[PDB]
Amino acid sequence: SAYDSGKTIADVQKSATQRIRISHRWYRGRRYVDVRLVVVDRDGDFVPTRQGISIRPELLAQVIQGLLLASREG
């Protein structure tokens, strides 16, 4: 399980046992926006998995724009 550092910005619920967690992480002088699958524990809280990406802030707009475009498929 990934090291659970960083500030949760938003938790998007996938199911009773999974969420997509969007968080800020600071590491070695540098901030990242982390987007990661997290899974439920025995106490109703969630634990981060390795299935996630870490995005430097200057790439966020492009990731947003790509998702906006992906929303038009259907």
Residue 58 near Cl ion by CB under 5 A:
no
Contact between 14 and Cl ion per CB under 5 A = yes
Which residue intervals of 6-70 are DSSP H helices?
60-70
**In the numeric block, which tokens belong to residue 6?**
């960083």
Per-residue tokens: 32: 């990242």
Residue 16's binding partner among its own copies, Cl ion, none (Cβ under 5 to 8 angstroms by kind) is: none
39 is an interface residue for its own copies by CB under 8 A: no
Is residue 35 within 8 A of residue 20, CB to CB? The reply is yes
Interface residues with its own copies (CB under 8 A) are 7, 9-10, 12, 14, 20, 22, 24, 31, 33, 35-37, 50-53, 55-57, 59-71, 73-74
